[PDB]
């Protein structure tokens, strides 16, 4: 067989120029898209101010519009999903991830408009949904739309343009190219069989988008936290511990998110009106929280800096944790077109910080700064739930710029999966596919 | 589908026995990586108390400056030709092939050979890295265990071999991320799904990184401080630089390759024609390591100086070419050493230079040569060894200028974009193909 290999080595890295050039168009498009979404989402959460503030006098009138607004949109979100693209509603990564293995379709002519405008509602309303999944999914479809419009053939051009469309997407959402790539090739890619996905092609896509994101998000990190202190070796084990905690909590949160999405399936049974209504329900609910305790509602991003800083008290952290842990499930699990990727960061950050404050007062001789742990865990809930350690660790770094904490960030997110494994649970993204994949059949 | 649905639900379940072993591997790789690193130095030290001793008599200096290197250099080649020919050279092509079950892991042989072997080539002053040397000394460590504990299976052979590699790369550049990203971008069998457990590699890499930390703390390998940033109007400049690395990519590959042939003659295959031609290039290097060190040695030490803009345009090109030579002559001469690190030094120096030009070319971009010195420190790896991702991430991991990521990728990408469109191939895969085809027949 060495006969073939010797001929394969000498044939390495020869990606069709036509392919490459298209990963460029993809990444570019994904980017512009990624931005528009991001921008549009905000623009709405804005209106949702000029609404409150206009009625800031009659308190009951606030809490009213603080509900209505979210609700109305949230509903509009769900509606555009249940009636035009059920494949959308929810993360969106399980789908694209499955579509990679040729197990689910890329109804881009449907998904794009839905997921996009659909999320503007859910997110623009104030729900506990990220923007990651939403774009990663909006991404692949972009890469697929091109694949079709230029009818590029040969699996390579279908698994590659679908993959770059993903990373292009992920990167243009956290402004993190490395993470965008490392993600596809650690999670998204068909997990059990060699594939025709050209890396060099993905990069170009990711880059193109990262630029697009740089053209409009110029001059403003998403999560500025400044250079935190360092981490001696004698304080290393503390990060293992934190990981182990994330590890046992990892699968559990997965059970919830999962079951929770079942226990919520009843309420509507499958009825569009029982959904759309239960939609604006959790929606309006969120918008309310986004004026009476924002740390429990919305994206969560904004509180990551505050948390790391040590601005939240032990009391307020635990409140924020649980509160979110709930709004998160209730929002994601309710099949709303949104993600659970970003919000997971928020949880890890908050949970880490908390761990820190305890660590600090426990060992004043380690001269700790709870902020490190807030960062050693910002991606650990990703290393236990979605079990994508590498993509996390590198996504964190890519946006917390504290490389001096890489040795600790790994020692946590590793310990994360080490216990997320040894205690049941599975890739929260893979399980969702397995189910939707199984539910596909097992019903005929 | 039914299968998949059952596979998904079966993801990430690496045998506890396996994992626990990647830990011992990484640990060992680490201590090893250190001892190697430490020993090499220790020797380059002696060569000081040696010169200083004969610092009075100049010719006497230049003499011992040759002898010492030569003597060791030979001792290196010797311990390779006569005990493990599989060593001599990078060591990555081997392990890389051994991953596809196409070469053997004569660890009971390689370990002692490559190790003490490199202490000579390196400890003497040759233009050889320490990367490959350890990545290779690595897999063998993970193999030695595989054997001593007969953990059966392919997973335990492809995994303990892999983690031993990353553990190895990591403990060499103190860059865990790189160590891992490497295996899964280059080293891993390039054309068929495999039984290598990532979660296992990590644990390995980590354990070694710790090991490196336990003995290297408080001092980086390449300290460069926070460099300026990089507006988008100056991005294309980095593309250009990538395209340059992309054309020079394969070429340097040709040389490295051919040069190792044109060097095969001199000894024919004779152990004495080698060992002698060994301390020949060796003693040569150690001479240069006292009359123009930028041409000789590892090259690391001048990466900082280069980025700073301390070298003049003149001195850079001198240093480039000079190294471009000593590099080939040293690596291509089958000496037990690597071409990974020294490739960095070239990209750095080649980048800097590009910078100083860009600077005076566009004073309105308020450029700092130092940024290009970093957008290329791993671009020669993105054209020669065609392992962009591992490079980009290995640079970051040790230059710490994430602000430059958008540039670094736009160069290294353009690197492989031209290294491709203009012939060439993974200098590490070609060496395997060669050594693999020259095998059968």
């Amino acid at each position: 067989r060495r006969r073939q290999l010797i001929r394969q080595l000498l044939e390495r890295d020869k990606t069709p120029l036509a392919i490459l050039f298209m990963a460029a168009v993809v990444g570019t498009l994904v980017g512009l898209a990624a931005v528009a979404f991001d921008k549009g989402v905000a623009w709405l959460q804005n209106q949702r101010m000029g609404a409150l503030v206009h009625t800031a006098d009659n308190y009951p009138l606030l809490l009213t519009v603080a509900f209505l607004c979210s609700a109305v949109l949230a509903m509009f979100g769900y509606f555009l999903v249940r009636k035009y693209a059920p494949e959308a509603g929810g993360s969106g990564i399980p789908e694209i991830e499955g579509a990679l293995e040729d197990q689910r379709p890329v109804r881009w002519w449907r998904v794009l408009p839905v997921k996009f405008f659909g999320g503007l509602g859910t997110l623009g309303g104030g729900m506990v949904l990220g923007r990651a999944g939403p774009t990663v999914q909006i991404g692949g479809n972009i890469g697929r739309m091109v694949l079709d419009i230029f009818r590029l053939k040969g699996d390579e051009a279908r698994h590659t343009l679908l993959a770059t469309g993903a990373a292009a997407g992920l990167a243009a959402a956290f402004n993190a190219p490395l993470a965008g790539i490392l993600f596809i090739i650690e999670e998204m890619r068909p997990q059990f069989r060699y594939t025709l996905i050209s890396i060099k092609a993905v990069f170009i896509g990711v880059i193109m988008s990262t630029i697009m994101y740089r053209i409009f998000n110029h001059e403003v990190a998403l999560i500025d936290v400044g250079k935190l202190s360092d981490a001696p070796l004698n304080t290393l084990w503390l990060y293992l511990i934190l990981g182990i905690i994330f590890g046992i909590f990892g699968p559990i949160f997965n059970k919830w998110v999962l079951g929770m999405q079942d226990l919520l399936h009843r309420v509507h049974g499958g009825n569009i009106t029982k959904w759309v209504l239960m939609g604006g329900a959790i929606g309006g609910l969120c918008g309310l929280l986004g004026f009476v305790a924002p740390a429990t509602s919305g994206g969560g991003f904004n509180l990551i800096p505050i948390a790391t800083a040590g601005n939240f008290s032990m009391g307020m952290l635990v409140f924020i944790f649980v509160a979110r842990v709930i709004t998160t499930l209730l929002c994601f699990s309710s099949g709303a077109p949104g993600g659970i990727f970003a919000p997971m960061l928020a949880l890890g950050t908050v949970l880490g910080t908390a761990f820190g404050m305890v660590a600090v007062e426990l060992f004043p001789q380690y001269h700790l700064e709870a902020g490190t742990f807030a960062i050693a865990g910002m991606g650990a809930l990703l290393a236990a739930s979605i079990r994508a350690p590498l993509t996390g660790i590198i996504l964190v770094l890519e946006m917390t710029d504290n490389y001096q904490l890489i040795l600790p960030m790994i020692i946590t997110g590793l310990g994360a999966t080490l216990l997320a494994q040894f205690t049941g649970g599975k890739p929260l993204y893979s399980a969702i596919l397995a189910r939707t994949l199984a539910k596909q059949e097992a019903e005929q | 589908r039914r299968q998949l649905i059952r596979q998904l639900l079966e993801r990430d379940k690496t045998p506890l026995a396996i994992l626990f072993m990647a830990a011992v591997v990484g640990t060992l790789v680490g201590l090893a990586a250190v001892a190697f690193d430490k020993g090499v130095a220790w020797l380059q030290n002696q060569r000081m108390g040696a010169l200083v001793h004969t610092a009075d008599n100049y010719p006497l200096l230049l003499t011992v400056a040759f002898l010492c290197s030569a003597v060791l250099a030979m001792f290196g080649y010797f311990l390779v030709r006569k005990y493990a020919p599989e060593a001599g050279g990078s060591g990555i092509p081997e392990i890389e092939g051994a991953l596809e079950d196409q070469r053997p892991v004569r660890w009971w042989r390689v370990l002692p050979v490559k190790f003490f072997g490199g202490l000579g080539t390196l400890g003497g002053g040759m233009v050889l890295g320490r990367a490959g040397p350890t990545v290779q000394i690595g897999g063998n460590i993970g193999r030695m265990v595989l054997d001593i504990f007969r953990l059966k299976g392919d997973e335990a052979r492809h995994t303990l071999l892999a983690t031993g590699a990353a553990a190895g790369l990591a403990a060499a550049f103190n860059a865990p991320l790189a160590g891992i990203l490497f295996i899964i971008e280059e080293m891993r069998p390039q054309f068929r799904y495999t039984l290598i457990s990532i979660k296992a590699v990590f644990i390995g890499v980590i354990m070694s990184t710790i090991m490196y930390r336990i003995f290297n703390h408080e001092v980086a390998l390449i300290d460069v401080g926070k460099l300026s940033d990089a507006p988008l109007n100056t991005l294309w400049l980095y593309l250009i630089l990538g395209i340059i690395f992309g054309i020079f990519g394969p070429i340097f590959n040709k040389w490295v390759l051919g040069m190792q042939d044109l060097l095969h003659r001199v000894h024919g295959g004779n152990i004495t024609k080698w060992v002698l031609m060994g301390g020949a290039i060796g003693g040569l290097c150690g001479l240069l390591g006292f009359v123009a060190p930028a041409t000789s040695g590892g090259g690391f030490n001048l990466i900082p100086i280069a980025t700073a803009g301390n070298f003049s345009m003149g001195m850079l090109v001198f240093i480039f070419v000079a190294r471009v030579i000593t590099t080939l002559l040293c690596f291509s001469s089958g000496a037990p050493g690597g071409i990974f690190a020294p490739m960095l030094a070239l990209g750095t120096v080649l980048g800097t230079a590009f910078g100083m030009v860009a600077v005076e070319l566009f004073p309105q971009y308020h450029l700092e040569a130092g940024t290009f010195a970093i957008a290329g420190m791993g671009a020669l790896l993105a054209a020669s060894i065609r392992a962009p991702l591992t490079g980009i991430i290995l640079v970051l991991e040790m230059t710490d200028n994430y602000q430059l990521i958008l540039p670094m990728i736009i160069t290294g990408l353009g690197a492989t974009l031209l290294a491709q469109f203009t012939g060439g191939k993974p200098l590490y895969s070609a060496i395997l193909a060669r050594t693999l085809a020259k095998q059968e027949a």
Partner: antibody, heavy 120, light 107 residues
Framework: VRLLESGGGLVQPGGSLKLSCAASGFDYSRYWMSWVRQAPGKGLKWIGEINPVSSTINYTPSLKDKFIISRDNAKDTLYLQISKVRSEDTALYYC??????????????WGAGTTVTVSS | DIVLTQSPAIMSAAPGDKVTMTCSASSSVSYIHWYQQKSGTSPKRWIYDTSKLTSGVPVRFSGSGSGTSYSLTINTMEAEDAATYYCQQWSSHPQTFGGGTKLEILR
């Protein structure tokens, strides 16, 4: 974030004055400091610019050492020496902080001012 | 050294009026800037890269132009806009400022 430049004043033709500019409210490093002067009534005319590590310093089409910009990041202070001064040198001297958008640099945060009048 | 020359040297219009000042370059420039200067104060970075209002600039102000000739505009100007506006380029070294335009309010 404040830029307070002193030094200014009265100098006799053919003289030399060291205008200072103390920065505060931000990181002096990472920053390209410059000077621009406004002649009473007239507009602005860029004088010079000196990068962080001061390994770069370019002036306007000036002479040899008419101008001599420097900086002591150890005191987050920008300097400007003017030798053999003449009436054309009587204007308001601002020290700005430089930055950019897409990359075509601008004068970010201009300091106070300081005046120099050349006269006997 | 580009020769930026701001069209109206001095102009007056009544608040709520649409005012527009020009700034032509001798050669070619791109991503112009504009600084506002009110009596007694050092210049203030208004619009940049041809049309990016600076954090604070009333959305009243708009930037524009292209290579040879740019402009700054105020849709319905307000009396607090009385000042001197200076367009400046650095798409060619050394940088260069325009002659300025003094806005005066009619009341």
């Amino acid at each position: 974030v404040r830029l307070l430049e002193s030094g200014g004043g009265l100098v006799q033709p053919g003289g030399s004055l060291k205008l200072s500019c103390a920065a505060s409210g931000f990181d002096y490093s990472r920053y390209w400091m410059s000077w621009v002067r406004q002649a009473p009534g007239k507009g602005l005319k860029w004088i010079g610019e000196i990068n962080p590590v001061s390994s770069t310093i370019n002036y306007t089409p000036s002479l040899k050492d008419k101008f001599i910009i420097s900086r002591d990041n150890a005191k987050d202070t920008l300097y400007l020496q003017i030798s053999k001064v003449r009436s054309e040198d009587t204007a308001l001297y601002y020290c700005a902080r430089l930055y950019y958008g897409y990359g075509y640099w601008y004068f970010d945060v201009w300091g106070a001012g300081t005046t120099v009048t050349v006269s006997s | 050294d580009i020769v930026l020359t701001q069209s109206p040297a001095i102009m007056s219009a009544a608040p709520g009026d649409k005012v527009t000042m020009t700034c032509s370059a001798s050669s070619s420039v791109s991503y112009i800037h504009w600084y506002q200067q009110k009596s007694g104060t050092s210049p203030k970075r208004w619009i940049y890269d041809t049309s990016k209002l600076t954090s604070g600039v009333p959305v009243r102000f708009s930037g524009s132009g292209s290579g040879t000739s740019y402009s700054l505009t105020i849709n319905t100007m307000e009396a607090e806009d009385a000042a001197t506006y200076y367009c400046q380029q650095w798409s060619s070294h050394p940088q260069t400022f325009g002659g300025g335009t003094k806005l005066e309010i009619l009341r």
